[PDB]
Short mmCIF file of C-alpha atoms in Angstrom, two decimals:
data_model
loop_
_atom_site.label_atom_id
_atom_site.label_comp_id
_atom_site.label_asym_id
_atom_site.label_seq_id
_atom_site.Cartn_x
_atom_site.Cartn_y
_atom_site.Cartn_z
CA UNK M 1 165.15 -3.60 58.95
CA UNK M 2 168.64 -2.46 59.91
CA UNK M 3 169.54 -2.24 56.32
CA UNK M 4 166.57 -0.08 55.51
CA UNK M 5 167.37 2.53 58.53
CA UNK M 6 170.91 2.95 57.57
CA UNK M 7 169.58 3.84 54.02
CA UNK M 8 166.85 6.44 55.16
CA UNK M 9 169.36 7.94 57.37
CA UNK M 10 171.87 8.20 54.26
CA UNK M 11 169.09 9.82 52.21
CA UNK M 12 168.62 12.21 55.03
CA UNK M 13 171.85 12.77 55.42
CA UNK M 14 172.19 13.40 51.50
CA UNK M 15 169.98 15.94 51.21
CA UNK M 16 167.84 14.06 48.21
CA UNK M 17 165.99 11.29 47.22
CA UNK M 18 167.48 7.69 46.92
CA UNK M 19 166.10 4.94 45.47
CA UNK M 20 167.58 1.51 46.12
CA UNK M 21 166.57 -1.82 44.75
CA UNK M 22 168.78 -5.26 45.66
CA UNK M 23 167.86 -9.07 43.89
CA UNK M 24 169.54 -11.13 45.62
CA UNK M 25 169.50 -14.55 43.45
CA UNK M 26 170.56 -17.03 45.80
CA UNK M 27 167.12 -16.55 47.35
CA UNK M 28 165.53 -14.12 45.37
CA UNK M 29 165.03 -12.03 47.97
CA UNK M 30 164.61 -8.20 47.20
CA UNK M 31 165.40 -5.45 49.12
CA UNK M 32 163.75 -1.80 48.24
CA UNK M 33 164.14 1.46 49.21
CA UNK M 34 161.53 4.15 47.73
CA UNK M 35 161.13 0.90 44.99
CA UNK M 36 158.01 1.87 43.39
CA UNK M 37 159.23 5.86 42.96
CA UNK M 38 159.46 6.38 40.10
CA UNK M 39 163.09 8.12 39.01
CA UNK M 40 165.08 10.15 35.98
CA UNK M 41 167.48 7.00 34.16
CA UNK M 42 169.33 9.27 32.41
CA UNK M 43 172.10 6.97 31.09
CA UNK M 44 170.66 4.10 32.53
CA UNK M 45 168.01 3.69 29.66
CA UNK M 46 171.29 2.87 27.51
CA UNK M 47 171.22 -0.37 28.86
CA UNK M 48 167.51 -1.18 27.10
CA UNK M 49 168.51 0.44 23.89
CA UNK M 50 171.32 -2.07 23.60
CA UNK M 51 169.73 -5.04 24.43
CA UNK M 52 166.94 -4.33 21.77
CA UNK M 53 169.28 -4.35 19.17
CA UNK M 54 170.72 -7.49 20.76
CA UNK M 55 167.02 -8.87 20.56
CA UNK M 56 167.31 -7.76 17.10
CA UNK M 57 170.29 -9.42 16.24
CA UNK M 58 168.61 -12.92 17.60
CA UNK M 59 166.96 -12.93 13.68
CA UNK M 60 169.13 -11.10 11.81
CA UNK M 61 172.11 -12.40 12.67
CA UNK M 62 174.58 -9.84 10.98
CA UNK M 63 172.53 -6.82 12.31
CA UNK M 64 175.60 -6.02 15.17
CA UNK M 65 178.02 -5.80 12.08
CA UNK M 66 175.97 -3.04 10.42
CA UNK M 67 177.50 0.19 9.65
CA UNK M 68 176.29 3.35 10.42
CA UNK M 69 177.47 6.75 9.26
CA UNK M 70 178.39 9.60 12.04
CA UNK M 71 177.70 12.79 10.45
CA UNK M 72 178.67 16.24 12.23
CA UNK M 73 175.02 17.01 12.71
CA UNK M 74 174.54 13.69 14.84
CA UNK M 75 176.55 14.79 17.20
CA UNK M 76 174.90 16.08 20.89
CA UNK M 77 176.78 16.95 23.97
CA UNK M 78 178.92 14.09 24.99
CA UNK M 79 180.36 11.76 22.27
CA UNK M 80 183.31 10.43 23.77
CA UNK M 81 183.60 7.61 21.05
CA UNK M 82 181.71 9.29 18.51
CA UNK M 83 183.35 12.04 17.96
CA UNK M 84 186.37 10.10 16.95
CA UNK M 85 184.38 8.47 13.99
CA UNK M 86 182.89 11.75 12.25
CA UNK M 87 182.63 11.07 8.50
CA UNK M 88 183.38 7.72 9.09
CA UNK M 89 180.81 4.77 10.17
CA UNK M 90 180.28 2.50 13.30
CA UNK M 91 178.93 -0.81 13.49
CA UNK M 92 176.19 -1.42 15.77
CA UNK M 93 177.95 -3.12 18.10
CA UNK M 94 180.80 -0.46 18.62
CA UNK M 95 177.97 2.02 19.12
CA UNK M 96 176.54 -0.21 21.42
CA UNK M 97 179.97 -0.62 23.19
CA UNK M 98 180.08 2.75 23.30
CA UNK M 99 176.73 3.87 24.40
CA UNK M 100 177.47 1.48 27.55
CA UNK M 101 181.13 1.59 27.81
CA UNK M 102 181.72 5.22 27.55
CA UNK M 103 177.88 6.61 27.84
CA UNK M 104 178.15 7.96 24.70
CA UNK M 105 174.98 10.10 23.88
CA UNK M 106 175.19 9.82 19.88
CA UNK M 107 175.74 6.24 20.26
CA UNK M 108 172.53 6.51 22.26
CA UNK M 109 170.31 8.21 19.43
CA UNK M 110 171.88 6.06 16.95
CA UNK M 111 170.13 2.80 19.02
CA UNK M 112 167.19 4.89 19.35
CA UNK M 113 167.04 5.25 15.57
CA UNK M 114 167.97 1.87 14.80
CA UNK M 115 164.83 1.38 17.07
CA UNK M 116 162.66 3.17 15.25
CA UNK M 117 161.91 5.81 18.05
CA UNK M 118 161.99 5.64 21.81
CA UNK M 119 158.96 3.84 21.14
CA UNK M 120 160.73 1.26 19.69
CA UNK M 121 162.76 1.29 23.09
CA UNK M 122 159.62 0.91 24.85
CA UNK M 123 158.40 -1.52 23.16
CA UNK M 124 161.34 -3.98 23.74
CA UNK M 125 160.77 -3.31 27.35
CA UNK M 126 157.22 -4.01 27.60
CA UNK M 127 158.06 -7.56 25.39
CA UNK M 128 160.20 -8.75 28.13
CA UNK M 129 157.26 -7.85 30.95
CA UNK M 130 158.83 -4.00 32.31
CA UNK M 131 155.57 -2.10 32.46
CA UNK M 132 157.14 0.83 34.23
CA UNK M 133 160.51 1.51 31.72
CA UNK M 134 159.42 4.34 29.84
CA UNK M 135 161.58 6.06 26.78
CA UNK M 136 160.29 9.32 25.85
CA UNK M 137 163.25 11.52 24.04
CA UNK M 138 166.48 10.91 23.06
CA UNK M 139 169.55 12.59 23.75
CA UNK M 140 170.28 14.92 25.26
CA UNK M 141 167.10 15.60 26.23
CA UNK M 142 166.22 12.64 28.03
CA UNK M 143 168.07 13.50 31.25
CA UNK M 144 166.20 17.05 32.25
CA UNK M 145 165.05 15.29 35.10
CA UNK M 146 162.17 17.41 36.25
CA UNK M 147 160.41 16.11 39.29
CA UNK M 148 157.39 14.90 39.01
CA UNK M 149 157.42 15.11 34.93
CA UNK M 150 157.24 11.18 34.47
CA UNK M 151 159.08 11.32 30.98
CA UNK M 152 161.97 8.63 30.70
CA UNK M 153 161.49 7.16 34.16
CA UNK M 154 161.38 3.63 35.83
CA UNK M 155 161.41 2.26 38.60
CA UNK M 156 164.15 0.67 41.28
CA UNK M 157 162.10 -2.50 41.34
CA UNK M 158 161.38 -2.62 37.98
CA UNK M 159 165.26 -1.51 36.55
CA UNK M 160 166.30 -4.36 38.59
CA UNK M 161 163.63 -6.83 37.68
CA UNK M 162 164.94 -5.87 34.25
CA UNK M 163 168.42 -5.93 34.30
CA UNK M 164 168.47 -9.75 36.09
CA UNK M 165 166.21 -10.86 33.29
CA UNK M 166 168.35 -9.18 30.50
CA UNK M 167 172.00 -10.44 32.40
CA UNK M 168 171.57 -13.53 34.32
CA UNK M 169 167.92 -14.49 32.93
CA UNK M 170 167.03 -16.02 29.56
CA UNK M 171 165.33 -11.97 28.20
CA UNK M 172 168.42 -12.60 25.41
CA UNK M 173 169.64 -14.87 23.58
CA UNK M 174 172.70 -17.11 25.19
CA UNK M 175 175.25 -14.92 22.66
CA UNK M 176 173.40 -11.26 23.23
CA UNK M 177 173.01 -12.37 26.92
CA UNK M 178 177.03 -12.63 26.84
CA UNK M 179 177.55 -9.85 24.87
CA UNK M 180 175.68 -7.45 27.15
CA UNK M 181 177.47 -8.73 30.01
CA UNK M 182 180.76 -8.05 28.38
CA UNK M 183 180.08 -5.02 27.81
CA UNK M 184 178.72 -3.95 31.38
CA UNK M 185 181.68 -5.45 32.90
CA UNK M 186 183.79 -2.97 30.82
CA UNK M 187 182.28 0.14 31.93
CA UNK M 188 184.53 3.09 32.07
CA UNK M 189 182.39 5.18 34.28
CA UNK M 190 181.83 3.53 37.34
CA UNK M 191 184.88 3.49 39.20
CA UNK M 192 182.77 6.12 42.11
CA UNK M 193 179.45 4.83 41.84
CA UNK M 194 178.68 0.87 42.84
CA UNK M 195 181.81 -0.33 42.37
CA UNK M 196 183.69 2.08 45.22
CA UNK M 197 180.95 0.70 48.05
CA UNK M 198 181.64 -2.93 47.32
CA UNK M 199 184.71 -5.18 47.73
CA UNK M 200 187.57 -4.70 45.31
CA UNK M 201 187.44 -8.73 44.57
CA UNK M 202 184.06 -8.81 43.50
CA UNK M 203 182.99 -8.21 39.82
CA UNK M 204 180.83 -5.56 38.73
CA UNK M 205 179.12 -5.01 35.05
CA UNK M 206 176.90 -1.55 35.46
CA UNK M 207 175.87 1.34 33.98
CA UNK M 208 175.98 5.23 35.10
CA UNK M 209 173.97 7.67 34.24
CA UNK M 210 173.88 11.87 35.62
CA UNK M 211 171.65 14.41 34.47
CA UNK M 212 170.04 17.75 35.81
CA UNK M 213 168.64 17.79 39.30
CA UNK M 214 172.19 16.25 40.71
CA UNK M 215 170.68 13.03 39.30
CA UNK M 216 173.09 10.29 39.94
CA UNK M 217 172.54 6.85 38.97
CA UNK M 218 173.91 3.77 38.94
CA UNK M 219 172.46 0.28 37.68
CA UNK M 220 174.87 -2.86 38.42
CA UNK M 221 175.20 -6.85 38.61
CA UNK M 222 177.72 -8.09 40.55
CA UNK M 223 179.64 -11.36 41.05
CA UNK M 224 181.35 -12.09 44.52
CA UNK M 225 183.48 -14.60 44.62
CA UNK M 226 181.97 -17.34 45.58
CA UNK M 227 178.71 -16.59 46.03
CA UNK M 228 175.39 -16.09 44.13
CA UNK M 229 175.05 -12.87 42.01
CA UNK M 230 172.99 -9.81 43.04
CA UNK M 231 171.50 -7.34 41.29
CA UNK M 232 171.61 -3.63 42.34
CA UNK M 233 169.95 -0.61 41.54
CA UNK M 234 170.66 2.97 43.04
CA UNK M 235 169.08 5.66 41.89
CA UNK M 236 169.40 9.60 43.53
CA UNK M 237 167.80 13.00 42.70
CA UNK M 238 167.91 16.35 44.54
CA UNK M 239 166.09 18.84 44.57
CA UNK M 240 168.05 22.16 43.01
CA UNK M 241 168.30 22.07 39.30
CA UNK M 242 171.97 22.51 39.05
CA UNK M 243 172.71 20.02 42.10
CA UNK M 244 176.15 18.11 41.80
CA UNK M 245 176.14 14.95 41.21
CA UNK M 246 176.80 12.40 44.51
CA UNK M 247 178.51 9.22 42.99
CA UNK M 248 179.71 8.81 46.96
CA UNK M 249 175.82 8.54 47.72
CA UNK M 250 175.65 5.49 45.42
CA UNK M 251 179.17 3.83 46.76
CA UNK M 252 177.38 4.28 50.02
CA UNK M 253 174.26 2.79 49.42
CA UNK M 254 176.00 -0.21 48.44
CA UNK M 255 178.32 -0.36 50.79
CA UNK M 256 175.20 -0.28 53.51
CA UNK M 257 173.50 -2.81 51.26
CA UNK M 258 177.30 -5.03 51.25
CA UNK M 259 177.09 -5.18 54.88
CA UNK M 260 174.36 -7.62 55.52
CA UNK M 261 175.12 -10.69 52.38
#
């Protein structure tokens, strides 16, 4: 299709490897580019640590207001939020906010811990039927992004199928569901990614995530205004270790995927 041409020829054009996947509920029609690839998340697996503590919360109902201790030696290489609560504590639900929010790494390994492990991660995917999600490390070295290593990978189609079941499907309960959408919708980092492709009028909740290999991600839902919401995943690697990233590869991609709905 014409959509699918104008992304191959921005992947050519990019130099790297992009991986697009589009829900489109009115219909639930999909559109996939490279959607069965598997990719790097990076800090797009902070999306699944959150919601299992969210699933968590749905029996113990106080879990979000938890505290948890930062201690110097928790903290990895990017802890935005964090870092400004050394010695102090967090409740789950601000280092949820800020694992999302801010793509806070600690915040990260703290849902990881409260997990029990990136199996514990894993798990909470394979509950809500992602086959493909895999959590293997925690941060920071989750994002190494080698190709070909399949560690802490998914899928377009299946990071999509995902995040519509955790967002706009029934994966959470009605409060976590809300919560999680909150939060996405108050992303910090997105500004270049999604968001910059798409009209300024429509809404956006999403999550980011870089690592090595110029990996540039971005994971969205998004409201128009008046008009059913879609789901978008964009996903791009390269090929030199130390590759910038290419946030204007993912405002394209969705700016090629805008023109069409």
């Amino acid at each position: 299709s014409a959509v699918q041409q104008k992304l191959a020829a921005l992947e050519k054009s990019s130099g790297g490897r992009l991986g697009v996947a589009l829900i489109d509920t009115a219909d639930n029609t999909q559109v996939l580019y490279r959607g069965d690839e598997r990719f790097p998340m990076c800090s797009t697996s902070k999306v699944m640590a959150a919601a299992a503590v969210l699933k968590q919360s749905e029996t113990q109902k106080q879990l979000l207001n938890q505290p948890v201790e930062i201690k110097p030696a928790d903290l990895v290489n990017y802890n935005p939020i964090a870092e400004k609560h050394v010695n102090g504590t967090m409740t789950l639900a601000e280092l949820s906010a800020a694992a999302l929010q801010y793509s806070d790494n600690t915040a990260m390994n703290k849902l990881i811990a409260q997990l029990g492990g990136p199996g514990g991660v894993t798990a909470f995917a394979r509950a809500i039927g992602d086959e493909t999600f895999r959590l293997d490390r925690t941060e920071p070295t989750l994002n190494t992004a080698i190709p070909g290593d399949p560690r802490d990978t998914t899928t377009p189609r299946a990071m999509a199928q995902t995040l519509r079941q955790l967002t706009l499907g029934h994966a959470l309960g009605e409060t976590q569901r809300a919560q999680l959408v909150t939060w996405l919708k108050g992303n910090t980092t997105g500004a270049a990614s999604i968001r910059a492709g798409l009209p300024t009028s429509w809404t956006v909740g999403d999550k980011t995530g870089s690592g090595d290999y110029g990996t540039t991600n971005d994971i969205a839902v998004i409201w128009p205004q008046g008009r059913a919401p879609l789901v978008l995943v964009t996903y791009f690697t390269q090929p030199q270790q130390n590759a910038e990233s290419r946030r204007d590869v993912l405002a394209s991609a969705a700016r090629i995927i805008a023109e069409g709905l």
